[PDB]
């Protein structure tokens, strides 16, 4: 039985348990700022940032055919200067060991319009309506494609704290993602089945990707805390 877990309620500059990509930085105030931002807080267009947990996670085993169960939770906020013109969004994802940034903007740094490059499984918090999207901002479960296999409505709130919980149950293959704004007492939830064996390598890294809009600022994305725990039985 392999397990790993970690948690923290601040990030900390230059922390070596964190791999940053693109525009990502950790502020003095302890936020994982995923996007480039001007002096007063305003996001720049075509920003993209990612951040991975250092440690690769053993997600399934070929020998035994067993699959990991896991849980991830985090608080995130966004700042949109113009609340009626929004910037693609943010996602939690699993990807290969060596994952690098993919197409930005509406592909969220995670997928591409072509066939693919990586094998990615993700839960998206999507602010802008692309051609493959349903109307209005939403949560989505994405399996090797930016076209979510299922979505649900996401009750955005500018600046407010979103508490996310994401779980995967290997016994049912059910991925479940919930979002809560405690200040608003609003909740959203989503669930679908995902076969990890056919959508991810045995070992992956997990992390966050957030993209701002192509021609427009849209919104910045800050992750404030993070927990994860995973269990791979025989």
């Amino acid at each position: 039985a392999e397990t790993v877990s970690f948690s923290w309620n601040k990030f900390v500059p230059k922390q070596p348990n964190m791999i940053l990509q693109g525009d990502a930085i950790v502020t003095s105030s302890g936020k994982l700022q995923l996007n480039k931002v001007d002096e007063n807080g305003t996001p720049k267009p075509s920003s993209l940032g990612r951040a991975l947990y250092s440690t690769p996670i053993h997600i399934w085993d070929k020998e035994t055919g067993s699959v990991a169960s896991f849980a991830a939770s985090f608080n995130f906020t966004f700042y949109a200067p113009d609340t009626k013109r929004l910037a693609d969004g943010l996602a939690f994802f699993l990807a290969p060991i060596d994952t690098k940034p993919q197409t930005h903007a509406g592909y969220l740094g995670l997928f591409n319009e072509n066939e693919s490059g990586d094998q990615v499984v993700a839960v998206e918090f999507d602010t802008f309506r692309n051609s493959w999207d349903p109307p209005n901002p939403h949560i989505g479960i994405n399996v090797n494609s930016i076209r979510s296999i299922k979505t649900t409505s996401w009750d955005l709130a500018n600046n407010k704290v979103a508490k996310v919980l994401i779980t995967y149950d290997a016994s049912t293959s059910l991925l479940v993602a919930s979002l809560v704004y405690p200040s608003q007492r609003t909740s959203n939830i989503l669930s679908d089945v995902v076969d990890l064996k056919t959508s991810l390598p045995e070992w992956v890294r997990i992390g966050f990707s957030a993209a701002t809009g192509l021609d427009i600022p849209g919104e910045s994305h800050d992750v404030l805390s993070w927990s994860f725990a995973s269990n791979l039985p025989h």
Binding site: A105, G106, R129, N130, S131, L214, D215
Partner: peptide, 4 residues
């Protein structure tokens, strides 16, 4: 209407 999607961008590009």
């Amino acid at each position: 209407p999607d961008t590009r």
